[PDB]
Amino acid sequence: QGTILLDLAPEDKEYQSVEEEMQSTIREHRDGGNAGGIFNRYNVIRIQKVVNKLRERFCHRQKEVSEENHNHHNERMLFHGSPFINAIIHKGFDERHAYMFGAGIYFAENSSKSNQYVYGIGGGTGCPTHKDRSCYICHRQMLFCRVTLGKSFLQFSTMKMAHAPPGHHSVIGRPSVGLAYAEYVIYRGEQAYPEYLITYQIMKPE
Ligand SMILES: Cc1ccnc2c(NC(=O)c3ccc(N4C(=O)[C@@H]5[C@H](C4=O)[C@@H]4C=C[C@H]5C4)cc3)cccc12
Ligand SMILES: [Zn+2]
């Protein structure tokens, strides 16, 4: 049937919950805003629920992970940012299209970290039209996803990895003095479901 995008109304508590998580998880980064831009809030202009009967591939894998993890799939809602959001919502996450950065699909609990990836690694060259990484005009997109972490392997760097170590299902790169915030990585596209599609703009500091 394909993906059906359902619009959430801002007066719906599901809409508010999603925006709140995004707006409150904004943190300042050490790069002076070079990658994701300079801003204190987002102008959330749209939130759509992604419906794709993907859910099954996702639920199936979740069962495998659970058996393998003492009946604990260890789900977390996390943000994802990359230049391939539209492909993802239709075809699902795919580890074959993966790219420091290893060969995994990255997620973050802080929206501002995922915003740095919207136009690519380090923000790339910025938006296609103005080639500005701090564009306040162009609409950006990011996903708030269900991520099956199962047994996570914790470490200080992930540029090295291609797969989760034995007995594990995800890799969490953590802060050193190295990273500033945690990054969650999976190596199988089916361990993540693109629950919400957020359309937004970063707003200039008032
Ligand atoms: C048709 C089609 C064409 C191109 N793509 C597709 C796709 N794509 C992913 O599922 C994907 C996106 C970004 C990363 N991906 C990350 O999450 C990390 C790195 C990376 O490449 C760098 C960027 C974000 C950070 C840093 C890894 C995987 C999924 C489904 C279809 C696709
Ligand atoms: Zn722009």
Residue numbers in the entry: 1104 to 1156, 1158 to 1203, 1207 to 1284, 1286 to 1314
Wording from the paper:
The two highly homologous human tankyrase isoforms, TNKS1 and TNKS2, are members of the poly ADP-ribose polymerase (PARP) family of 17 proteins that share a catalytic PARP domain. These PARP proteins cleave NAD+ into ADP-ribose and nicotinamide and transfer the ADP-ribose units onto their substrates, resulting in a post-translational modification referred to as PARsylation. Tankyrases also mark axin, the concentration-limiting component of the β-catenin destruction complex, for degradation, and tankyrase inhibition antagonizes the Wnt signal transduction pathway by stabilizing axin and promoting β-catenin degradation. So far, two different classes of potent and selective small molecule tankyrase inhibitors, 4-((3aR,4S,7R,7aS)-1,3-dioxo-3a,4,7,7a-tetrahydro-1H-4,7-methanoisoindol-2(3H)-yl)-N-(quinolin-8-yl)benzamide (IWR1) and 2-(4-(trifluoromethyl)phenyl)-7,8-dihydro-3H-thiopyrano[4,3-d]pyrimidin-4(5H)-one (XAV939), have been identified.
The crystals of the TNKS1/2 complex diffracted to 1.9 Å with synchrotron radiation. There are two crystallographically independent TNKS1/2 complexes in the crystal structure, highly similar to each other (with a backbone rmsd of 0.6 Å). The TNKS1/2 complex structure reveals that 2 does not bind to the nicotinamide pocket but instead occupies a different pocket, which is not present in either apo or XAV939 bound tankyrase structures. It only becomes available upon the binding of 2 and we thus refer to it as the induced pocket. This induced pocket is created by the movement of Phe1188 of the α3 helix and the D-loop, part of which is disordered in the present crystal structure, away from one another. The binding of 2 to the induced pocket of TNKS1 suggests that IWR compounds are likely non-competitive inhibitors of tankyrases. In the crystal structure, 2 adopts a conformation in which the central phenyl is almost perpendicular to the norbornyl group and rotated by about 60° away from the plane of the amide group. There are three hydrogen bonds between 2 and TNKS1. One of the two carbonyl oxygens of the pyrrolidine dione group is hydrogen bonded to the main chain NH of Tyr1213 and the carbonyl oxygen of the amide group is hydrogen bonded to the main chain NH of Asp1198. The CH at the 6-position of the quinoline is also involved in a CH…O = C hydrogen bonding interaction with the main chain carbonyl oxygen of Gly1196.
